[PDB]
Symmetry: none
Subunit: 186 residues, 2 copies
Amino acid sequence: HMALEDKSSKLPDYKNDLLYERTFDEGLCFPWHTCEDSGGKCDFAVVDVPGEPGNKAFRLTVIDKGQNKWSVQMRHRGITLEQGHTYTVRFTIWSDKSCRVYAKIGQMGEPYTEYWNNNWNPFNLTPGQKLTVEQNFTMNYPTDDTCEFTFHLGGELAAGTPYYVYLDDVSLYDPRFVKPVEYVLP
Amino acid sequence: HMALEDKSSKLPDYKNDLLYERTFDEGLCFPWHTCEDSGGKCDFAVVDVPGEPGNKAFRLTVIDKGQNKWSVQMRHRGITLEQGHTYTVRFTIWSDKSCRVYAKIGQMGEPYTEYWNNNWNPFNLTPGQKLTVEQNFTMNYPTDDTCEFTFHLGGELAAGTPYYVYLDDVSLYDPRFVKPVEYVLP
Ligand SMILES: [Ca+2]
Ligand SMILES: [Ca+2]
């Protein structure tokens, strides 16, 4: 189905982004979705950012933290990391409670090799503090088309349930990547 | 419909082409279609080009010449010629009989202004002879979004019916034109 380019002034060119939705400002989040596993429970909506007309954010409700950090996630699959390419990972996240969020890009399936993960450190969210992250890394492993960009929220990362975690302005940029185009008329 | 880019080593860049189908090599022709008018009858199909593995071409069967040159046509609509732009018209045409083909890019409706038309001359097709045309013209009239690239085959142009006219490698290139792109997700 048909995806939506954005022309955000604070992100790199959409055409070189491996992600298909970055700003949620149309109320749409696809291909971003949630996962429940091992007892986790969650919901999602795209919602207005208070004080910032026009601006909307992806909002995950953590309902049950389940049995593991990976019991609750928000993710974007369909990611190939290319040997030799240098990626810029970018995102704004916040929460209405004190919680942790483990961000990673890595294999969807076993053995779940992690290609990026903020050097094994989750991010500490604090109410009233938004975190805008920007990091680079270079894929030194063989090219891997089975990757996802995922945030784990469950288990010992979780605050008291239920609560909200927000994502916005999310980008995985590669200067040597261009999305496949299709042409339409019109 | 979604359109399929080609990367012909003989045509200019697909993204700069006002035409959505140029090589026919997949078995598909859309938006190239036929028209029958004032007595004309015809058919079409995409068929293999004998002796040239993997090459296909649009084939028009002229069934009945009708009353006018315009009674039988093969044509691509959805063409905006823009004032001051310079357009390269390209095409390869041939037939199993001696006939004439009138090629033009002009208005779809009354008054049928013709912006390019090989200086009012139809092309003379002879069996065993393929014609590859390449001409430039600049659009000196005001931009007109009601144009088509049409080939007339009826009336006094026509050979003894039925017979086939073939079209291949068609392109209408403008260096200052870029097709709009949609993004689709693999
Ligand atoms: Ca937003
Ligand atoms: Ca062909």
